[PDB]
Amino acid sequence: NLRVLLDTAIPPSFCDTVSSVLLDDFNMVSLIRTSPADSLATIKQDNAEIDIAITIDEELKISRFNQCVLGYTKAFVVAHPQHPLCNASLHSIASLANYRQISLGSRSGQHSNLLRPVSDKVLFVENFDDMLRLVEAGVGWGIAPHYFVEERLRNGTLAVLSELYEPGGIDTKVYCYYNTALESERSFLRFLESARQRLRELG
Amino acid sequence: NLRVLLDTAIPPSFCDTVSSVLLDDFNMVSLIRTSPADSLATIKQDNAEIDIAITIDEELKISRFNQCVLGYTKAFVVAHPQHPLCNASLHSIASLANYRQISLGSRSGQHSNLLRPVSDKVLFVENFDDMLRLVEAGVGWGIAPHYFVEERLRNGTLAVLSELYEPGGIDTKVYCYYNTALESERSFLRFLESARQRLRELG
Numbered sequence: 001n002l003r004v005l006l007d008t009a010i011p012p013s014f015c016d017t018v019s020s021v022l023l024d025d026f027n028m029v030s031l032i033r034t035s036p037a038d039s040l041a042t043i044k045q046d047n048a049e050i051d052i053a054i055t056i057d058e059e060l061k062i063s064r065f066n067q068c069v070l071g072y073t074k075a076f077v078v079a080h081p082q083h084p085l086c087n088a089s090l091h092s093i094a095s096l097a098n099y100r101q102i103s104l105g106s107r108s109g110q111h112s113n114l115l116r117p118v119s120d121k122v123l124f125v126e127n128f129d130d131m132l133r134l135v136e137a138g139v140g141w142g143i144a145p146h147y148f149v150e151e152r153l154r155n156g157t158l159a160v161l162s163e164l165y166e167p168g169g170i171d172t173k174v175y176c177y178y179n180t181a182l183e184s185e186r187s188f189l190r191f192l193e194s195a196r197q198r199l200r201e202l203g
Numbered sequence: 204n205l206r207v208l209l210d211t212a213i214p215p216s217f218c219d220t221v222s223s224v225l226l227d228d229f230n231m232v233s234l235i236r237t238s239p240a241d242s243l244a245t246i247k248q249d250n251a252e253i254d255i256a257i258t259i260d261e262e263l264k265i266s267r268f269n270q271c272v273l274g275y276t277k278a279f280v281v282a283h284p285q286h287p288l289c290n291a292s293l294h295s296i297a298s299l300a301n302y303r304q305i306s307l308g309s310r311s312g313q314h315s316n317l318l319r320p321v322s323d324k325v326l327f328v329e330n331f332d333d334m335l336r337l338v339e340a341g342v343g344w345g346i347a348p349h350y351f352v353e354e355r356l357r358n359g360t361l362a363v364l365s366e367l368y369e370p371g372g373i374d375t376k377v378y379c380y381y382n383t384a385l386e387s388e389r390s391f392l393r394f395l396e397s398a399r400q401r402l403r404e405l406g
């Protein structure tokens with residue numbers, strides 16, 4: 001029955017919050033994980049027959065789907081704690097566009113404004129694990145969700161650069177793309193209401 | 204000396220917060236108001252010789268300028284309290300793309316993804332006052348900053364539709380575009396630090 005796709009930028013908590021709720025109302029629920037760079041591409045494939053996507057990625061008006069927002073979540077631009085650009089911010093926060101960035105690659109090779117890399121050179125990868133191996137290494141810098149990075153962060157293995165750009169990490173909305181058929185379906189509305197109401201915390 | 208441009212979506216408080224601070228460090232400070240639809244166009248004109256823009260509008264990498272974020276602020280999609288789409292949300296929240304929208308026109312006729320109208324027909328205007336005359340009228344619906352609308356809102360003259368899309372109004376970042384020359388200038392940094400630190404409230 002209900003197939004829902006969850007990108008990797010979504011905290012793995014925001015995912016049990018969901019799944020608990022949908023089983024009340026639904027009797028078969030499949031959960032698919034996906035690069036954020038591939039989320040929206042995927043739901044456009046009709047055969048893939050997704051009914052709900054949870055992503056950070058944005059695009060206005062899609063084919064058969066509607067959009068709304070569930071919450072907010074944070075990402076950081078990170079590097080090795082002696083990457084040149086470490087320390088020395090504001091000026092160097094503009095020089096990111098010169099340094100090598102480790103970006104999430106997409107299947108379609110295409111990117112949204114939101115996820116397109118800011119610099120060159122870019123070195124593409126499949127997911128945030130590969131990304132951090134590399135910035136820990138540390139060739140390049142990257143933007144990764146909080147949940148990934150906070151482990152290493154307090155451990156001093158990685159440092160943040162995002163801070164003078166946006167203190168507190170880069171606030172980023174979490175969207176919900178849902179097949180229009182679910183608009184005003186007593187059950188979907190419960191999921192929305194309940195997912196949101198919960199997803200204040202973590203925050 | 205210092206010329207700073209402030210779009211109309213910026214609360215008129217976020218504007219005294221700024222202006223107080225800059226006079227400590229600056230001795231001539233001009234403040235220009237602008238449609239958000241025209242903010243960025245304007246700072247690209249070189250003759251206009253703007254040193255700092257405060258806008259909700261977004262564009263990545265501009266000519267001589269850097270970007271960072273000062274805070275957050277809210278906007279609502281509003282209409283006449285017996286506009287068809289009133290009441291009846293979620294489905295109708297998708298039918299906005301069919302109803303007439305009152306959008307902020309731009310000089311260049313061009314719009315960013317962020318400000319481009321969602322529907323047609325569109326009926327362009329110069330500013331948020333014209334916009335509300337019209338949605339109060341009420342031909343069409345529009346998106347307007349909180350500060351404008353909260354007056355009329357509790358007064359029942361206008362109703363919100365944004366709520367199932369994004370409860371609490373549509374969170375929207377407030378960017379700072381500052382000429383690169385000001386990067387690491389003891390004074391600019393004070394302004395940033397102090398503007399931000401204050402602009403938590405209102406919120």
Ligand SMILES: CCCCCCCCCc1cc(=O)c2ccccc2[nH]1
Pocket residue numbers: 009056074075077093096114115118143144145161162165170172
């Ligand atoms: C200091 C440089 C700021 C440039 C960042 C531009 C805004 C962030 C957009 C964004 C890009 C991502 O790759 C991303 C990845 C995971 C989660 C949020 C993200 N936000």
Ligand SMILES: CCCCCCCCCc1cc(=O)c2ccccc2[nH]1
Pocket residue numbers: 212259277278280296299317318321346347348364365368373375
């Ligand atoms: C319920 C329909 C949601 C569609 C709104 C799309 C996100 C809002 C982007 C935006 C458009 C504006 O015109 C605007 C104007 C002033 C302040 C913030 C704004 N945000």
